[PDB]
Paper text:
VACV protein N1 is an intracellular virulence factor that is expressed early during infection and modulates innate immunity by at least two strategies: preventing apoptosis and inhibiting NF-κB activation. N1 is a Bcl-2-like protein that contains a surface groove similar to those in cellular anti-apoptotic Bcl-2 proteins that bind the BH3 motif of pro-apoptotic Bcl-2 members. The VACV Bcl-2-like proteins N1, B14 and A52 all form dimers via a common surface comprising alpha helices 1 and 6 (the ‘1–6 face’). Biochemical and structural analysis of these mutants demonstrates that the anti-apoptotic activity of N1 relies on a hydrophobic groove on the surface of the protein and that the anti-NF-κB activity requires an intact dimer interface.
By analogy with VACV proteins A52 and B14, which have the surface groove filled by bulky amino acid residues and do not inhibit apoptosis, we introduced the bulky residue tyrosine at positions R58, Q61 and R71 in an attempt to ‘fill’ the N1 groove and thereby exclude BH3-peptide binding. To determine if the point mutations introduced in N1 generated unanticipated structural changes, R58Y, Q61Y and R71Y N1 were expressed in bacteria, purified to homogeneity and their structures determined at 3.0–3.1 Å resolution. All three mutants crystallized in the same space group as wild-type N1 and the overall structures of all three closely resembled the wild-type protein (0.21–0.39 Å r.m.s. deviation over 108 Cα atoms). For both the R58Y and Q61Y mutants, the tyrosine residue protruded into the groove in a manner likely to reduce BH3 peptide binding. While WT N1 and the groove-filling mutants (R58Y, Q61Y, R71Y) were all dimeric, the I6E mutant was almost exclusively monomeric. Introduction of the groove-filling mutations R58Y and Q61Y abolished the ability of N1 to prevent apoptosis, while mutants R71Y and I6E inhibited STS-induced apoptosis as strongly as WT N1. Investigation of N1 mutant R58Y binding to Bid and Bad was unsuccessful because this mutant bound strongly to all proteins examined, including both pro-apoptotic and anti-apoptotic Bcl-2 proteins and tubulin, for unknown reasons (data not shown). Expression of WT N1 decreased NF-κB activation significantly, as did expression of the groove mutants. However, infection with vN1.R58Y or vN1.R71Y induced lesions that were indistinguishable from vN1.WT. Considering that R58Y N1 was no longer anti-apoptotic and I6E N1 no longer displayed anti-NF-κB activity, our results indicate that suppression of the N1 anti-apoptotic activity does not significantly attenuate VACV virulence whilst suppression of NF-κB activation does.
Numbering used by the authors:
A (entry chain E), B (entry chain B): 1 to 114
The structure:
């Protein structure tokens, strides 16, 4: 799940067809769980501060169930998409927090998606 | 370079043909810079300790030139290959250190390889 999510989020950022996989189809379905307004806000703040700061703050919120975990994946993916490839983001810092919060749900998320 | 190296190292770990790209061909050439004995030792220690600890210790060594930077990429790649996909490694912790050391050489590494 760690490798899959890294690959997915990075592909959402750059849109390189050579790095696409059908495994992503099921993960892209998680987008319905997230309100486009929350993403829009997060992007505005990231641009206002010229940093990944607002994203790292979003990812630090508690994850109490599988639905919270799915929303975190979706928010990261939608943010990656909407921020653009030119954005100088140390993605590994975001993955560190994301996986710290969602790690436990990996087994169940895999079952849920596939 | 950050995205490319993440993608390369993860592909070296699982050998998933669906996640392969021809950009990796030039990076795989860096393997000649690394002695297989150093990798063998690193793997032995990682298994002895049941941790990525030895790898994170290797990556914390100073990088004084582009050749040091290339050796770090090659050691990470050969370790990723030899440790196996089943290995529960928090890859983002390794990428954090690797990129902290090699970040500056990215522009020059890109020129050197492509």
């Amino acid at each position: 799940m760690r490798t899959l999510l890294i690959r997915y989020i990075l592909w959402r950022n750059d849109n390189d067809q050579t790095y696409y996989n059908d495994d992503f189809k099921k993960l892209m379905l998680l987008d319905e769980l997230v309100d486009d307004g929350d993403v829009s806000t997060l992007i505005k703040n990231m641009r206002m501060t010229l940093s990944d700061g607002p994203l790292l703050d979003y990812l630090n919120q508690p994850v109490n169930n599988i639905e919270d975990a799915k929303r975190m994946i979706a928010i990261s993916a939608k943010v990656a998409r909407d921020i653009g490839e030119r954005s100088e983001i140390r993605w590994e810092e975001s993955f560190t927090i994301l996986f710290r919060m969602i790690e436990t749900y990996f087994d169940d998320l895999m079952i849920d998606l596939y």
